[PDB]
Amino acid sequence: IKARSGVFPFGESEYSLWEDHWIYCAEKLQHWEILTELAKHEGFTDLLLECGWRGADWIADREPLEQSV
Amino acid sequence: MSRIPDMDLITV
Amino acid sequence: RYIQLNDKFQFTDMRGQYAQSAQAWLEAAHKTQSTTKRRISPLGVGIESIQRGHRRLRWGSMLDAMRKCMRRREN
Amino acid sequence: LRLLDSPQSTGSISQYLTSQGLTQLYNTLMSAD
Numbered sequence: 001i002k003a004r005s006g007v008f009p010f011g012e013s014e015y016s017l018w019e020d021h022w023i024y025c026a027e028k029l030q031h032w033e034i035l036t037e038l039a040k041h042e043g044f045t046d047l048l049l050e051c052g053w054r055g056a057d058w059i060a061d062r063e064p065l066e067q068s069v
Numbered sequence: 070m071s072r073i074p075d076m077d078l079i080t081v
Numbered sequence: 082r083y084i085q086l087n088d089k090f091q092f093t094d095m096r097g098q099y100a101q102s103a104q105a106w107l108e109a110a111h112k113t114q115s116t117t118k119r120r121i122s123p124l125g126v127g128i129e130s131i132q133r134g135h136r137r138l139r140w141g142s143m144l145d146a147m148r149k150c151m152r153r154r155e156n
Numbered sequence: 157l158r159l160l161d162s163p164q165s166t167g168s169i170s171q172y173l174t175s176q177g178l179t180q181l182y183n184t185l186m187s188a189d
Contacts, residue, residue: 001147001169001173001178001181002165004144004181004185005168005169005172007165008163009078009079009080009081010079010080011080011081012080019139019143026146031150031153034146034149034153035146037146038142038143038145038146041133041145042133042134042139042142043133043134070129070189071130071131071138073131073138073141074188075128075129075137075138076188141182141185144178144181144182144185145182147178148175148179148182151173151175152175155175
């Protein structure tokens with residue numbers, strides 16, 4: 001929030017770190033439902049990790065999961 | 070122009 | 082991307098193992114691009130038209146997630 | 157100095173930390189066009 005509000009200089013280095021480690025801490029804290037929309041909007045490899053492996057059932061809606069895999 | 074505006078920010 | 086950007090590429094000029102398989106894959110990709118309007122070959126876009134998946138425009142979706150995290154914590 | 161010096165900051169994030177503050181910031185930054 002500080003970096004995006006321009007309060008101090010904005011450097012892409014360590015900002016990539018902030019983004020990635022926020023996602024990491026979010027998935028460790030079991031915030032899967034929140035991460036679902038983020039994965040859908042940005043496109044990622046954890047969409048399988050959270051949507052099927054911990055959210056939606058594999059026996060149903062197989063085609064999107066098969067396409068992703 | 071893209072959907073999300075692109076604005077420059079100061080750096081280190 | 083290198084083949085696209087070189088623009089001096091020739092299919093028969095290439096030599097080495099995996100030559101025929103890659104040639105067939107490229108031909109199939111070109112045929113699919115001709116038949117179907119969807120793009121398979123990589124494409125380049127200037128810095129003005131940053132698209133959805135780029136690192137420059139992560140912050141919108143990320144801030145959406147941030148707001149929902151605040152909502153959950155306040156609940 | 158490179159190791160031990162950190163850029164300064166201002167305490168303007170007190171209001172933004174609230175969820176409504178994040179909604180306001182998101183609306184302002186999305187509609188910055």
